[model samples]
Target: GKNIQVVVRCRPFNLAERKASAHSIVECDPVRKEVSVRTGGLADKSSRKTYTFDMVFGASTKQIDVYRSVVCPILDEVIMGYNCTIFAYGQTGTGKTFTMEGERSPNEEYTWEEDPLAGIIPRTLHQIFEKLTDNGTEFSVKVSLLEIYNEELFDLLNPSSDVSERLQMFDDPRNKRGVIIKGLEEITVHNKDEVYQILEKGAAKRTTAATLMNAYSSRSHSVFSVTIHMKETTIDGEELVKIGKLNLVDLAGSENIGNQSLLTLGRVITALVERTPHVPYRESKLTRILQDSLGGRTRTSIIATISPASLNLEETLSTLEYAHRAKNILNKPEV
Candidate 1:
C-alpha cells in the first residue's frame, strides 16, 4: 500500500502585481517541505498557518524544476507498466494551467521539445521516447485528449468532428476499474516531430471551441492520456507485450464556479481522505474519470497551486487544507 502524494506549489506575483507593490504572505521552505502562511489581522507573526506536503515549490521554482522533482519518478513507474496520474489542483489564477501545460516563449527561442518553459506533458512525452528508445525496447505510444465541460465530453484530438458534438462513456466490460470513452481518437506517435504537431492540434481545437463558447476554456477540465504498449523479448526468446498509462489532469477553477462536477470531486476527495464507508464515484463525470487514481491500483499525485499574495488568502487556505487531507489517502498501487 502506498499513500497518494500531495505537493504544494506557490506561484509568484506577476509583473503587474509586482509593479502594484503587492505584499507576499506565503513562504515555502523546500528543505523542510513546509508552507507557512501569515494569518490576517497583521498582529502576531506567530499567528501563521503551517502545513507539510510530500514536496514544496516556492515562487522562484521553474518549470524544469517542477518536472524534475515531481514527474521524473512518476514517469519511471509508468514505464514499468503502472497506471499513473498527476493532477494540478487549485482555484483560477493559481497557475494550474501554468504548471500543467506551461507556455511557449513568444520569440520562439528553443525547439518545442527543449523549451525551458515546457511543462509536464511535453517534457514527459520527450522523456518517454528517449528512455524507451535508449533501452532498445519496442514500444508504441498512443495519445488521447479529452475535455469535459458542462457535463459533456469533447475529444480534442478528433479533427473530423466539431467540438460542439459530445462523446459518450460506458463501463468497460473486461476491467471492473475501467471505463471506455466512445468515439475518442487515439493517435500513435513515432517521433518527436509528431509529438509537437499533436499538441499543437489539440491546443488549436481547444482554443477554437473555447472562443466559440464563452468562458469555456477556463471552465473546462482536460485529461491528456498516454498509453504505452511495450513489447519485449524474454531470456527464453518469448515475446510479450505490456501495457502502461499516464494521465495528466488539468482541473478547473476550485472555488465559486457553482460547478457541480468540481463539487462532486471535492466530496469524493473528502470521502477518500476521511476513510468513509461510501465513496461517491458515480456522482459526477470528473470523479468517474478519476476512480482508479483516487483509491484504486493506480499511482496518483496532486500538485495544489497557490498564490503568494494575501489577497488570495481565503482560496489559498482552502486549497492547502484540502490538499493536506489528500495526503492521507492510502492507495493500493500495482503494475
Candidate 2:
C-alpha cells in the first residue's frame, strides 16, 4: 500500500473579507510546514493555535510553484505505469476550482497553454503530451469528467448528451469488476488544444449556485480523469501495453455549501484513521466514485484549501483540523 500525502494551501483575503473589515486570522509558514491561527484575542493581546502539515503553501505561492512541487513528480510516477489521485477540498470560493481548473484571461491575450492562471489539470495534460511525444513513446490518452451533485451522477464530457441530463448507475460492464461510471464518455485526447477545449466546455456546464460570500460557486464534485495507454515493444518484438490513470478531484457537495458529499468525505477519513470496522465510502456518490483511490493503493494527495480571514474563522478551523487528522492515516503506514 502507498502512503497518502496531505498538504494545505491558504488563499489570500478575498474581496468579501476585505469588504467586511475582517483581519487576517491564519498565517502559513511554508518553511516550517505549519499553520498558525489566531484562535482568540484578549485585552488587545493575541492567542494562537498552530498545526503542522506535510506541505504548506502561503497566499503568495504561484501556480507554477504548485505544479513543479506536486504535479510534476506525480506525473513522473504515472508515466512509470502507476495510478495517482490529487484531491482539492474546500468550501465555496476557497480556490479549489481555482487551483484545479485555473482560469483564462478575458482579453484573450494568452493561449490556454501559455496563461499564468492555468492550473494543475491543464499543466499536467500539457506536460504529458510534450514529454511522451518527444520520447518516441507509443501512447493514447483519454479523458472523462464526472460531476457528483446532490448525490446524482452527471457527465460533463458526454458528446451525445448535455450535463442537464442525469446519469443513472455505475459499472464495470465489460470486465465485471470494480465500479465504473456507466455511460460516462471517455473521449480520446489527440492534441493539447482538444483536451483544453473539452475541459472549458465541461466547466461551463458544471452545476453552480450563488453563495452568500462568493460569486456563484461550484455545487458539485467534479472528477477529471486522464488515462494513458502506453505501448512498448520488447527486444523480440513482443508488444505490451500499460494503462495508467490519474484522477483530479475538484470536490464539493451541494445544498448547504449544505454539507452533502463533503460531509461524507470527513466521515470516511475519520473512519480510516480510527481503524474503524466500516469505512463508509458508500454513504455518498462522491466517495463511492473514488472508493479505490481513497481507500486502496493509489498514490493519493489531499490538497486542503483554506481561507485566511477572521470572518471565516470557524470554517477555516474546521477545514484545518480535518486537514491535520487526515495525516494520521498516513503516519502509521497502510495495512
Candidate 3:
C-alpha cells in the first residue's frame, strides 16, 4: 500500500501547564494504535472522539521508541533508492521542536547513548552512516537546510546571506526536475559530525520569537534534507547510479492561519487526498518546496503532536482534524 503513515504523540504537561494545574484529557492505547480525545471540562459522553492510526505514543514514551517505530523503516527504503519524508506537525508548545531538534546544551556532547534526549534528526543521520559502512556501499551525501517564513523562501545553510532576501523557485527544462531552488547551498558531508555542524550553523539562522504560547517559538517551517548518491557495480562489471532524498520537515506551529504556513500545507494535502483537478502547490513556499514530498513519489510519515492540557483544547482539536484528513492521502512511490 502506498498510503502515508500518520502517528500521534501526546506530550506531558510542560512547566507552565503543570504549574497551572492543567488536567490531561488525551489517552493512547499503544496495543491497538488508537488515540482518544475528550473535550476538556466536558462531562457528557458525546464529547469523546477516537482515531486509529499506524502508531500512537503517550507522554511517557522514550525518544528512541519513536525513532524505532516511526522512522527506522523509512530509512531502509531511502537506502534502496526511494525518496522519503517525515514531518513534525502540531500546535505551539506541543513538543514539535523538542521532538525534532532535541535539547541543545553547550555543556553536553552529542551521543546516541543519550537516547533519552537525542531527537530524530541526529538519530537518522547516525543510522545512515552506520548502515552505509556496514554494507560497504560507496556513498556521498549532501545536506541542505531552508526555511519558509512569511510566504518567502530563504536558505538557512548560507549564513552570510540576508535571511530576509527571498530565494526563487525555478524549473530546469533540461533535467526536468520537478522543482528547484535557485542559489541554494548544499554542502557535501563526509561524516556525522560534519552533518551536525552544518545543522548547527543552519539552526542559528532559523527564525524564532518569544510568543505567549512558547518561550522560543519557531516562526518558519525549516526543512533539513539529505540527498544521497550511491554507486554500485553489477555482476557484468557495469556501473549504475542510485539517488535517494530524505526530507525531515519541522513545520511552524499553528498559532494562527496568518503566520502558520501549515494551513496552506493543509490545502495542498486536501486537494491531494480529494483528487481535485487543480492542486495548488504554489500557494505557499512550504508547499512549493515540498511539492514532491506531499503527494508525489515519496514515502511519507507524519508525527502529529498535541498537548493534553485544557487551555489548548481548540488548537489540539484542529491539529487532530488536520492530521486525520492527511491520512487519507496516498502516494505511489516510484524507484
- The global C-alpha lDDT for each of the candidates, from Candidate 1 onward, is 0.81, 0.75, 0.75
lDDT score of residue 255 within candidate 3:
65
lDDT of 3 by residue, 1-335 (tens): 24467889999888888888887777887877777678635755666777777788999988889998888888888887877888899887788877886765566564645545778887878888888878677898888987766666777788676545668988656543267788899998888756668777876766332221122335667788998898776576767678888899888876654354677777766676666797777777677677766655666788999988877878888888888777652322221
The sequence of per-residue lDDT tens digits that candidate 2 reaches over residues 1-335 is: 13567788899888889999999988888877788898778556567878887789999988889888878778887887777788898767778988987886666735544578888898888888898888678999999887766676777776566435777766655633247666778888889867668986675655332222122235667789999999876576677677778899987722244245676777777666566799788787777766766555456788888889988788888888777766652222212
Q: Give the TM-score of candidate 3.
A: 0.86
CA RMSD of each candidate after superposition: 4.6, 4.8, 5.3
What TM-score, computed on C-alpha atoms, does each candidate reach?
0.90, 0.85, 0.86
lDDT tens digits, residues 1-335, model 1? 14467889999887766777777888898987888888855764558777887788998899999998889888887887888888899988988888887877777655544687778888888898888888778988999998888888888899898657888889989976678888889999988646768988988999878887553767888899999989876686877677888899999887754368866776776676566798788899877876756655556778999988867778898898878665542322221
| Top-TM-score candidate index | 1
Candidate number that wins on lDDT, 1 or 3: 1
- lDDT (Cα) of model 2: 0.75
Model 3 residue 43 CA deviation in Å: 4.8
Arranged by TM-score, best first: 1, 3, 2
Residue 4 miss distance in model 3 (angstroms): 0.9
TM-score of 1: 0.90
